[PDB]
Amino acid sequence: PNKPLDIIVTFPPGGGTDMLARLIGNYLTESLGQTAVVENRPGASGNVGARLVADRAPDGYSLLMVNSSFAVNPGVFRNLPFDPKKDFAAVINVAYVPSVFVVPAGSKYKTLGELMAAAKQTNTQVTYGSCGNGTPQHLAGELLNVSAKTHMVHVPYKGCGPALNDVLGSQIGLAVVTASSAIPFIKAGKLQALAVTSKERSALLPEVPTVAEQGVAGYELNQWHGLLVPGATPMAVRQKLYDGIAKVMQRDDVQKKLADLGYSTASDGPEVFQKMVETDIDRFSALTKQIGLKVD
Template sequence: MAMDNRTGASGNIVTMEVVRARPDGYTLLLQNVSMATNDAAQGKLPYALTTDLTPLMLLSSTPHAIVAHPGAHISSIAELVDAAKAAPSQLTYASCGIGTPQHFAMKVLRQNMHIDMLHVGYKGCAPALVDVLGGQVPVAILSANLVPTYAQTGRLKALAVTTAKRYPQLPTTPSVAEQGGGNFDYDSWYALMAPGKLPTLLADKITADVLKVLDEPSVRSALAEFGIDISKGTAQELKTRIVEDSDRYLELARQNNIKAE
């Protein structure tokens, strides 16, 4: 297998390459929830989410984590709410970018908790992590797999994870829902897709082969080290997730005038 890691346009460039490829099973796409948030924040995409691509399977998922620099003296969602209400529109938080899954999740949290904060959208989670570690921003929402090392060494305070259940890599960090955040469940999922109109026999063969790989102890161990929870979701489950998330994020984007840069 040859990996072709292409970046740009929030994943739309590489996605279009797969859309244009022959549906012969030799070109596959590793996608994620950003395809749903892109659809919401960028307007109409140059491809149809579930017809120009063939959903194969959900591979894994990772929550987002809300963190604070120790100097912010914020250790929980309740303390975050108190700090935000004490200085409306002044408490700053970083996200991985405007229109990203993290941005949407924090927007919902702010609505649920009735707080107003100043958003700084970075170009990716990595630079947002660097600045919250350095104290340039007091609070951030990041991919949760980036957080455990810094939480364990005290360089960050993990306030909450955004999924309904706790994250195994941050077992003592409660979920947003546990802290009064309402029916709150947001994550980043990763999926395997192929060009549209891939023959069913080929789709079944690829899925069976991938499932065998995911069952290998070395693969499971490697993914666990990165804090990735293997899902093994079916093609239909993936298709349903894409449609539901696209609708959910589209409504949030309309309500809050969220547009990707």
């Protein structure tokens, strides 16, 4: 590393992806001795930032901060301006966060099972908010529909903040948002959590069951957050970046901060993370093909 790194964030400030990129950038600047400049390029669900990095030199100085949305995009954009498998190479996955099905304090829905019963029939009017059209949160509700054979109607919000405001005020009866956004409200008893979308609980919500354990067997949709580089970046460079970032993630202060927020820390490396990206691309594409979703 001999000039600044340029870390391009696919989502705007206020969300977990930007938070983690800026947390990494902060400690990376400290170590290895050049500014890791962090910048948000969030246009078209991260596609603007992705195309930008796809076109940078494969030298390790240009990185893309992603979440699972990156794997959703190939299935929901008609004409993606890059090859989401070939044009990127994974460096590190640093954190998971489950989604959570949340309802207002005093909602008639006491369990996920009650919600699914309410939404079993076709025409029907059980709406759920999400963090946005084509988000992993949106797809968590659609996956439940497909897996549980229910008919909940998706109402998108511009991020988790606005979705939470409407469930907080009972303007909508239900939303799917990230655990990290929702946890303070759930602890405060302003919201109730019906399920988490990970394979196992949560950690900060030990009394909230997974969707799978309620029982929609095989259901999971955990959002990852990590860094990619241009597809041709040699493995030695990916490993050098990996080593540095993993050292940041290993910090006590970093681990505590994330855990307190409801992030599950991770450190999947170049090979493992690359496999996860490609596997999720395939899986999400299959789901959004079933439900017929295009975002453009």
